[PDB]
Amino acid sequence: KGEELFTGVVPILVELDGDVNGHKFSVSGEGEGDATYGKLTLKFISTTGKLPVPWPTLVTTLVQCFARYPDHMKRHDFFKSAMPEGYVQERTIFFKDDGNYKTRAEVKFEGDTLVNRIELKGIDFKEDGNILGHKLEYNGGCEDNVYITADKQKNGIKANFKIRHNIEDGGVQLADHYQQNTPIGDGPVLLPDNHYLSTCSKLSKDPNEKRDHMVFLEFVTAGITLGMDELYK
């Protein structure tokens, strides 16, 4: 099925068109993903100058089909099973005491390259807030508690989760995510049982890149792993 499209290294193209409080911007990303290891290596650049929003706020928006699903859970990998036709990934991201992002992305194969084409709209942001004021630390993090549930009404997936962006000089800016995914193609997709995704992201800089950019390394993998110590008495 679509899982066989992720047996090896797959090129990735990411295109984001954003508009936050009237500030329009465009981000392009290139890299590769190895679903066998859940590994993502991507370099995003701003094609419109200095970003009006911090890079960490765009991480979740800027390809969960590269998540490492264990062998016994491949029967519930909706993201890969929707390929190559792909899926629509929609999100609303509420930044606590600030504005919100509304994103709609189409994730699909275009040849041998997996493309994530995104439209982002942000409203109600404070000019002196943590987002428009660039008060967030430039770093990623690990979020091991992301519950993916089946949305049989839309024949896809829904999920809600909180992202915690560290504020410079202390504090945490919360980003409440509400996500739904629906297949683009008519073909059968694997409606999953409820499970979890664990993601660790590392944000860095290319020393030879002059444009506003983000060097991005991410490991993402897919159930209740409690009680592992039971096997060892």
mmCIF file of C-alpha atoms in Angstrom, residues 1-136:
data_model
loop_
_atom_site.group_PDB
_atom_site.id
_atom_site.type_symbol
_atom_site.label_atom_id
_atom_site.label_comp_id
_atom_site.label_asym_id
_atom_site.label_seq_id
_atom_site.Cartn_x
_atom_site.Cartn_y
_atom_site.Cartn_z
ATOM 1 C CA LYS A 1 0.000 0.000 0.000
ATOM 2 C CA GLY A 2 1.090 3.575 0.671
ATOM 3 C CA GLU A 3 3.413 2.304 3.405
ATOM 4 C CA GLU A 4 5.755 0.941 0.717
ATOM 5 C CA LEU A 5 6.419 4.524 -0.436
ATOM 6 C CA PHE A 6 8.296 5.131 2.845
ATOM 7 C CA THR A 7 10.615 2.100 2.811
ATOM 8 C CA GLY A 8 13.667 4.281 2.182
ATOM 9 C CA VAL A 9 14.799 7.902 2.141
ATOM 10 C CA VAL A 10 12.123 10.145 0.613
ATOM 11 C CA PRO A 11 12.729 13.738 -0.552
ATOM 12 C CA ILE A 12 10.528 16.381 1.070
ATOM 13 C CA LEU A 13 9.312 19.735 -0.243
ATOM 14 C CA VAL A 14 7.509 22.103 2.135
ATOM 15 C CA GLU A 15 5.826 25.316 0.980
ATOM 16 C CA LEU A 16 4.024 27.623 3.410
ATOM 17 C CA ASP A 17 2.164 30.826 2.574
ATOM 18 C CA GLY A 18 1.369 32.726 5.759
ATOM 19 C CA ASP A 19 -0.561 35.817 6.827
ATOM 20 C CA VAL A 20 -0.392 36.858 10.495
ATOM 21 C CA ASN A 21 -2.092 40.132 11.496
ATOM 22 C CA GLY A 22 -1.748 41.294 7.899
ATOM 23 C CA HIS A 23 1.971 40.412 7.791
ATOM 24 C CA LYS A 24 2.344 38.159 4.756
ATOM 25 C CA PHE A 25 5.295 35.780 4.530
ATOM 26 C CA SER A 26 6.391 32.676 2.649
ATOM 27 C CA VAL A 27 8.514 29.752 3.852
ATOM 28 C CA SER A 28 10.048 27.060 1.644
ATOM 29 C CA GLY A 29 11.544 23.853 2.999
ATOM 30 C CA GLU A 30 13.631 21.045 1.557
ATOM 31 C CA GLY A 31 15.050 17.881 3.047
ATOM 32 C CA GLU A 32 14.412 14.180 3.429
ATOM 33 C CA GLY A 33 12.556 11.774 5.674
ATOM 34 C CA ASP A 34 13.239 8.177 6.652
ATOM 35 C CA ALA A 35 10.112 6.602 8.141
ATOM 36 C CA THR A 36 12.098 3.509 9.158
ATOM 37 C CA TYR A 37 13.761 5.708 11.795
ATOM 38 C CA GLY A 38 11.062 8.386 12.019
ATOM 39 C CA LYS A 39 13.830 10.822 11.081
ATOM 40 C CA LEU A 40 13.198 14.220 9.494
ATOM 41 C CA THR A 41 15.982 16.531 8.305
ATOM 42 C CA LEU A 42 14.643 19.762 6.817
ATOM 43 C CA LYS A 43 16.005 23.232 6.072
ATOM 44 C CA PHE A 44 13.370 25.969 5.949
ATOM 45 C CA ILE A 45 14.096 29.443 4.597
ATOM 46 C CA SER A 46 12.035 32.615 4.509
ATOM 47 C CA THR A 47 11.588 33.870 0.946
ATOM 48 C CA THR A 48 10.101 37.188 2.142
ATOM 49 C CA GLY A 49 12.713 38.460 4.607
ATOM 50 C CA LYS A 50 12.538 38.478 8.385
ATOM 51 C CA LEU A 51 9.647 36.335 9.579
ATOM 52 C CA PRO A 52 6.914 38.230 11.473
ATOM 53 C CA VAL A 53 6.510 35.211 13.786
ATOM 54 C CA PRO A 54 9.050 33.029 15.614
ATOM 55 C CA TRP A 55 10.209 29.876 13.847
ATOM 56 C CA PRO A 56 9.163 27.528 16.719
ATOM 57 C CA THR A 57 5.526 28.570 16.225
ATOM 58 C CA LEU A 58 5.627 27.178 12.664
ATOM 59 C CA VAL A 59 7.223 23.807 13.485
ATOM 60 C CA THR A 60 4.010 21.797 13.843
ATOM 61 C CA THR A 61 2.652 23.430 10.686
ATOM 62 C CA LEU A 62 5.791 22.935 8.569
ATOM 63 C CA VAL A 63 4.611 15.537 7.586
ATOM 64 C CA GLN A 64 3.531 12.985 10.192
ATOM 65 C CA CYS A 65 3.542 10.262 7.515
ATOM 66 C CA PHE A 66 7.260 9.868 8.322
ATOM 67 C CA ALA A 67 6.481 8.815 11.900
ATOM 68 C CA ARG A 68 8.104 5.527 12.899
ATOM 69 C CA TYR A 69 5.205 3.133 13.431
ATOM 70 C CA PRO A 70 6.148 -0.154 15.137
ATOM 71 C CA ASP A 71 5.490 -3.287 13.117
ATOM 72 C CA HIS A 72 2.421 -4.291 15.140
ATOM 73 C CA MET A 73 0.932 -0.798 14.657
ATOM 74 C CA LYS A 74 1.345 -0.441 10.879
ATOM 75 C CA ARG A 75 -2.311 -1.535 10.659
ATOM 76 C CA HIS A 76 -3.170 1.910 12.101
ATOM 77 C CA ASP A 77 -0.884 4.199 10.063
ATOM 78 C CA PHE A 78 -3.485 6.441 8.439
ATOM 79 C CA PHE A 79 -0.887 8.944 7.232
ATOM 80 C CA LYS A 80 1.032 6.431 5.108
ATOM 81 C CA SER A 81 -2.079 4.563 3.940
ATOM 82 C CA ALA A 82 -3.503 7.767 2.426
ATOM 83 C CA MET A 83 -0.442 7.984 0.145
ATOM 84 C CA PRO A 84 0.304 8.690 -2.651
ATOM 85 C CA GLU A 85 -3.016 10.571 -2.950
ATOM 86 C CA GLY A 86 -2.330 12.048 0.472
ATOM 87 C CA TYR A 87 -4.431 13.862 3.021
ATOM 88 C CA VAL A 88 -5.551 17.338 4.024
ATOM 89 C CA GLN A 89 -4.138 18.414 7.393
ATOM 90 C CA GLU A 90 -6.117 21.238 9.001
ATOM 91 C CA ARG A 91 -5.256 22.891 12.305
ATOM 92 C CA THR A 92 -6.336 25.709 14.556
ATOM 93 C CA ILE A 93 -3.554 26.727 16.949
ATOM 94 C CA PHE A 94 -4.652 28.918 19.855
ATOM 95 C CA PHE A 95 -1.773 30.803 21.464
ATOM 96 C CA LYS A 96 -2.834 31.458 25.051
ATOM 97 C CA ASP A 97 -3.579 35.140 25.739
ATOM 98 C CA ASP A 98 -2.731 35.891 22.103
ATOM 99 C CA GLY A 99 -3.822 35.187 18.535
ATOM 100 C CA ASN A 100 -4.431 31.924 16.734
ATOM 101 C CA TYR A 101 -3.187 30.165 13.614
ATOM 102 C CA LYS A 102 -5.551 28.490 11.172
ATOM 103 C CA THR A 103 -3.714 26.226 8.737
ATOM 104 C CA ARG A 104 -4.808 23.972 5.894
ATOM 105 C CA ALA A 105 -2.154 21.798 4.272
ATOM 106 C CA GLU A 106 -2.166 19.167 1.543
ATOM 107 C CA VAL A 107 0.401 16.417 2.144
ATOM 108 C CA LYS A 108 0.883 14.154 -0.868
ATOM 109 C CA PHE A 109 3.450 12.639 -3.210
ATOM 110 C CA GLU A 110 4.441 14.658 -6.288
ATOM 111 C CA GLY A 111 6.632 12.199 -8.140
ATOM 112 C CA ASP A 112 9.163 10.775 -5.700
ATOM 113 C CA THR A 113 8.955 13.858 -3.452
ATOM 114 C CA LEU A 114 6.495 14.194 -0.577
ATOM 115 C CA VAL A 115 5.088 17.730 -0.691
ATOM 116 C CA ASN A 116 3.573 19.661 2.227
ATOM 117 C CA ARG A 117 1.823 22.695 0.710
ATOM 118 C CA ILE A 118 0.416 24.903 3.466
ATOM 119 C CA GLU A 119 -1.723 28.021 3.842
ATOM 120 C CA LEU A 120 -1.571 29.771 7.222
ATOM 121 C CA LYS A 121 -3.774 32.579 8.547
ATOM 122 C CA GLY A 122 -3.141 34.265 11.886
ATOM 123 C CA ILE A 123 -5.461 36.782 13.560
ATOM 124 C CA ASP A 124 -5.912 38.596 16.878
ATOM 125 C CA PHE A 125 -2.202 38.658 17.736
ATOM 126 C CA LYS A 126 -0.807 41.316 20.057
ATOM 127 C CA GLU A 127 1.942 43.476 18.571
ATOM 128 C CA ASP A 128 3.785 43.338 21.916
ATOM 129 C CA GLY A 129 2.962 39.658 22.453
ATOM 130 C CA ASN A 130 5.351 36.730 22.474
ATOM 131 C CA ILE A 131 4.641 35.869 18.819
ATOM 132 C CA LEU A 132 4.740 39.239 17.055
ATOM 133 C CA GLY A 133 7.312 40.488 19.576
ATOM 134 C CA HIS A 134 9.708 37.573 18.951
ATOM 135 C CA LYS A 135 9.960 36.759 22.663
ATOM 136 C CA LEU A 136 10.154 32.968 22.243
#
